[PDB]
Each structure stands twice: as C-alpha cells, then as structure tokens.
Write a protein that holds these residues in place. Structure first.
Motif, PDB file in Angstrom:
ATOM      1  N   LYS A   1     -24.726  19.357  10.102  1.00 23.77           N
ATOM      2  CA  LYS A   1     -25.584  19.565  11.257  1.00 23.77           C
ATOM      3  C   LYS A   1     -27.026  19.442  10.889  1.00 23.77           C
ATOM      4  O   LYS A   1     -27.874  19.170  11.743  1.00 23.77           O
ATOM      5  CB  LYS A   1     -25.431  21.018  11.765  1.00 23.77           C
ATOM      6  CG  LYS A   1     -24.042  21.483  12.148  1.00 23.77           C
ATOM      7  CD  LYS A   1     -24.172  22.522  13.254  1.00 23.77           C
ATOM      8  CE  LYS A   1     -23.185  23.645  13.133  1.00 23.77           C
ATOM      9  NZ  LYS A   1     -23.778  24.896  12.585  1.00 23.77           N
ATOM     10  N   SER A   2     -27.328  19.778   9.627  1.00 21.54           N
ATOM     11  CA  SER A   2     -28.678  19.594   9.109  1.00 21.54           C
ATOM     12  C   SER A   2     -29.037  18.117   9.232  1.00 21.54           C
ATOM     13  O   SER A   2     -30.168  17.791   9.602  1.00 21.54           O
ATOM     14  CB  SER A   2     -28.787  20.036   7.646  1.00 21.54           C
ATOM     15  OG  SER A   2     -30.104  20.483   7.406  1.00 21.54           O
ATOM     16  N   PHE A   3     -28.051  17.262   8.941  1.00 23.39           N
ATOM     17  CA  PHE A   3     -28.203  15.813   8.985  1.00 23.39           C
ATOM     18  C   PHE A   3     -28.434  15.350  10.407  1.00 23.39           C
ATOM     19  O   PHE A   3     -29.249  14.485  10.666  1.00 23.39           O
ATOM     20  CB  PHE A   3     -26.935  15.172   8.432  1.00 23.39           C
ATOM     21  CG  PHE A   3     -27.013  13.696   8.174  1.00 23.39           C
ATOM     22  CD1 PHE A   3     -28.177  13.082   7.669  1.00 23.39           C
ATOM     23  CD2 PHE A   3     -25.859  12.912   8.323  1.00 23.39           C
ATOM     24  CE1 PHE A   3     -28.194  11.696   7.388  1.00 23.39           C
ATOM     25  CE2 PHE A   3     -25.874  11.543   8.038  1.00 23.39           C
ATOM     26  CZ  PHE A   3     -27.041  10.934   7.570  1.00 23.39           C
TER      27      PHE A   3
ATOM     28  N   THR B   1     -35.455  20.542   2.822  1.00 25.99           N
ATOM     29  CA  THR B   1     -35.575  21.453   1.671  1.00 25.99           C
ATOM     30  C   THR B   1     -35.023  22.843   1.983  1.00 25.99           C
ATOM     31  O   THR B   1     -35.227  23.764   1.212  1.00 25.99           O
ATOM     32  CB  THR B   1     -37.028  21.618   1.247  1.00 25.99           C
ATOM     33  OG1 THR B   1     -37.791  22.119   2.361  1.00 25.99           O
ATOM     34  CG2 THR B   1     -37.594  20.290   0.732  1.00 25.99           C
ATOM     35  N   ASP B   2     -34.362  22.975   3.136  1.00 25.46           N
ATOM     36  CA  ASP B   2     -33.639  24.171   3.565  1.00 25.46           C
ATOM     37  C   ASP B   2     -34.585  25.241   4.126  1.00 25.46           C
ATOM     38  O   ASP B   2     -35.790  25.047   4.138  1.00 25.46           O
ATOM     39  CB  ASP B   2     -32.734  24.694   2.429  1.00 25.46           C
ATOM     40  CG  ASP B   2     -31.355  24.086   2.476  1.00 25.46           C
ATOM     41  OD1 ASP B   2     -31.247  22.855   2.266  1.00 25.46           O
ATOM     42  OD2 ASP B   2     -30.385  24.833   2.731  1.00 25.46           O
ATOM     43  N   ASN B   3     -34.044  26.337   4.650  1.00 24.88           N
ATOM     44  CA  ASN B   3     -32.607  26.483   4.822  1.00 24.88           C
ATOM     45  C   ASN B   3     -32.121  25.866   6.123  1.00 24.88           C
ATOM     46  O   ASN B   3     -32.861  25.749   7.103  1.00 24.88           O
ATOM     47  CB  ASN B   3     -32.164  27.946   4.701  1.00 24.88           C
ATOM     48  CG  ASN B   3     -30.720  28.077   4.230  1.00 24.88           C
ATOM     49  OD1 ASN B   3     -30.269  27.342   3.351  1.00 24.88           O
ATOM     50  ND2 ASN B   3     -29.991  29.017   4.813  1.00 24.88           N
ATOM     51  N   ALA B   4     -30.873  25.429   6.081  1.00 25.19           N
ATOM     52  CA  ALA B   4     -30.136  25.045   7.258  1.00 25.19           C
ATOM     53  C   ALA B   4     -28.675  25.333   6.896  1.00 25.19           C
ATOM     54  O   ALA B   4     -28.188  24.739   5.933  1.00 25.19           O
ATOM     55  CB  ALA B   4     -30.361  23.570   7.565  1.00 25.19           C
TER      56      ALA B   4
ATOM     57  N   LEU C   1     -42.356  18.965   9.328  1.00 21.38           N
ATOM     58  CA  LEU C   1     -41.148  19.592   9.760  1.00 21.38           C
ATOM     59  C   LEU C   1     -39.926  19.023   9.051  1.00 21.38           C
ATOM     60  O   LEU C   1     -39.057  19.784   8.653  1.00 21.38           O
ATOM     61  CB  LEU C   1     -41.033  19.554  11.283  1.00 21.38           C
ATOM     62  CG  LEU C   1     -39.779  20.185  11.854  1.00 21.38           C
ATOM     63  CD1 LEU C   1     -39.700  21.633  11.431  1.00 21.38           C
ATOM     64  CD2 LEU C   1     -39.851  20.040  13.382  1.00 21.38           C
ATOM     65  N   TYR C   2     -39.837  17.691   8.867  1.00 19.70           N
ATOM     66  CA  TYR C   2     -38.723  17.075   8.212  1.00 19.70           C
ATOM     67  C   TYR C   2     -38.514  17.608   6.797  1.00 19.70           C
ATOM     68  O   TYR C   2     -37.397  17.866   6.358  1.00 19.70           O
ATOM     69  CB  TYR C   2     -38.914  15.552   8.221  1.00 19.70           C
ATOM     70  CG  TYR C   2     -37.794  14.854   7.654  1.00 19.70           C
ATOM     71  CD1 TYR C   2     -37.693  14.633   6.287  1.00 19.70           C
ATOM     72  CD2 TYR C   2     -36.782  14.382   8.480  1.00 19.70           C
ATOM     73  CE1 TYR C   2     -36.555  14.020   5.756  1.00 19.70           C
ATOM     74  CE2 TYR C   2     -35.705  13.693   7.973  1.00 19.70           C
ATOM     75  CZ  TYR C   2     -35.567  13.524   6.625  1.00 19.70           C
ATOM     76  OH  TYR C   2     -34.417  12.903   6.129  1.00 19.70           O
TER      77      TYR C   2
END
Lengths: 158, 158
Positions: free
Chosen positions: B3-5, B146-149, B140-141
């Motif tokens: 989902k991070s992707f 670089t987390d967290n997600a 933001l990217y």
C-alpha cells in the motif's frame, strides 16, 4: 537511507532535470516567437526595445535549460538508461543549436531565416525523445523499488 | 503488501500529469504565437497560409492539457498535498482562461486584443505554482518511502 534509495532517487532527479530542460526550451521558443512578432510590427515607439528585452529573455531561458541539462549529465546513468540517455543527447543538441541559431537570426533582424528553419520538427523530435526517456525511466524505476531488477550499479569506468 | 507503493506511485503519477499539463500549456502558448506571427506576415508570403492551422493546433494542445489536468484531479490527494493542489487549481484556471481568450481573439484575427492581454504574468504564476507543487511532492515522497508506512491515507470526502 539505503543504496537502492540512492539509485531510485537518482532516477527521479535525472527525470526532474530533463523536465526542467524541456520546460525551459519551450519557454525559449515562446520568448523567441514573442520577439519575432514584435519585429513584424510597425517599428520604434511601439517595441524596438521590447524586441530586445524578449530576445534577452530567450537567451536567459536557454542558458537555464543548458544548466539543467548539465546537471542531468552530472548524474551517472544506470547502464539500462545509457542508450535512451544518448538519444536525448542527440535530440537536445539539435534543438539547442536550433534555438541558438534563431536567437542569432532575430538579433540581426533576419526574420526570413527565422521562419525558414524547420524548428518545429526538431522540437517534436526532442519531445518524443523526452517521452521515450520517461517511459524507460519509469519502467526501470518500478523494477528497482519492487526489487524486480535493482541492477543496481551506476555506469562507471572500472 | 504494498500500500506504501500505491501511495508513492500515486504521487509520481500526479506529478507526471501536472508535468504534461504544463508542457501542453506551453505548447499552446507557442502555437498561439506561431499563429499570431503569420497573421502579421499576411498577403502572398506562403508562410501566412498556416495561420488557421496553427490556431487549431493551439486548440488541440490546450484540450490535451485539460485532459491531463482532469487525470490529475482523478487522483485523490494526500491531505499534506491539499493546499498546494488548491494553489495549482487557482493558477491553472487563470492561465487556462487566459489561453482560451487568446484563442478567441485570434479566431477573428484580432491580433491587437491578443497582444494587449497580459498573458505572461499568468504563465509565470502557473510556472511558480508547478515548482512549488513539485518541491512539496518530492519532499513528501521521500518522507513516505523512508517510512513509516503504515501510514499514509488519501483524502476523505464527507
């Protein structure tokens, strides 16, 4: 962070510099066309002065474009990007040279030679090269960040 | 996962549609200026005969620009991008309307109204807004990948 972060970041920055290059080449085209239309009007009083300031704006955007392109070249390519990077180079040098010749034609009042250049074809060819670059970059990028083929080495003369 | 992707890929796609929008607004501006110049060559010439074709090319690019912007708007923003998205909307709407008004003047060969409209400041404001967007997105990217997600949710709509 991470060495794949360095590589993925590099691809985004390379794309960012090419985007800036292309944007500034378009602004150069706009400025040159604005200058030309001024030279095609009843002279002095109106313009003859404006035409100079606009041509100077074209010089400025074109130098900025070249700066971004130099920053682009400062970032070592991923080996899978070398071919499309060279194609960018070929089309960029042709369009960059075209825009420098336009500046010159207008600087000496030569609207005929300005109109005569097949500028649009060279702009289109750059645009298409920039698009092919962005396709290849995006597909490599996906591979990198999903591990599907990191690579993950920069080009280098070892 | 990942989902991070989905989220990070969304930021990149959104930046890509805004890049396309800006590119195509600039090509609209170029095509308009190429039309205007031919409207001043006028008479025999040969070059002049393309003045309407070029204005139609401007209509085409502006419509493509609007389509890319609609694609941009199709992608839900992150809350952190809302402010800069709204600022883009404002500057886009002003520049889009400016370009349409230029088209409508040249539609009738009204080159004096075309020259009188103050297009350049709206263009510049758009450009600045696109720059600001791009910086906020990139920042933001980097935070995202670089987390967290977890962690990053798209805007809600009630």
């Amino acid at each position: 962070s991470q060495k794949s972060f360095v590589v993925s970041n590099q691809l985004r920055e390379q794309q960012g510099e090419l985007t800036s290059t292309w944007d500034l080449m378009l602004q150069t085209r706009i400025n040159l066309s604005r200058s030309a239309v001024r030279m095609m009007m009843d002279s002095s009083n109106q313009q003859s002065n404006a035409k100079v300031e606009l041509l100077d704006s074209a010089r400025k955007t074109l130098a900025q474009a070249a700066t971004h392109y130099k920053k682009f070249k400062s970032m070592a390519p991923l080996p899978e990007m070398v071919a499309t990077s060279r194609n960018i180079d070929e089309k960029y040098k042709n369009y960059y040279t075209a825009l420098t010749e336009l500046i010159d034609y207008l600087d000496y009042g030569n609207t005929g030679a300005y109109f005569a250049q097949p500028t649009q074809g060279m702009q289109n060819a750059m645009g298409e090269a920039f698009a092919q670059y962005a396709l290849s970059s995006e597909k490599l990028y996906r591979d990198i960040v999903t591990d599907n083929a990191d690579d993950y080495r920069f080009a280098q003369w070892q």
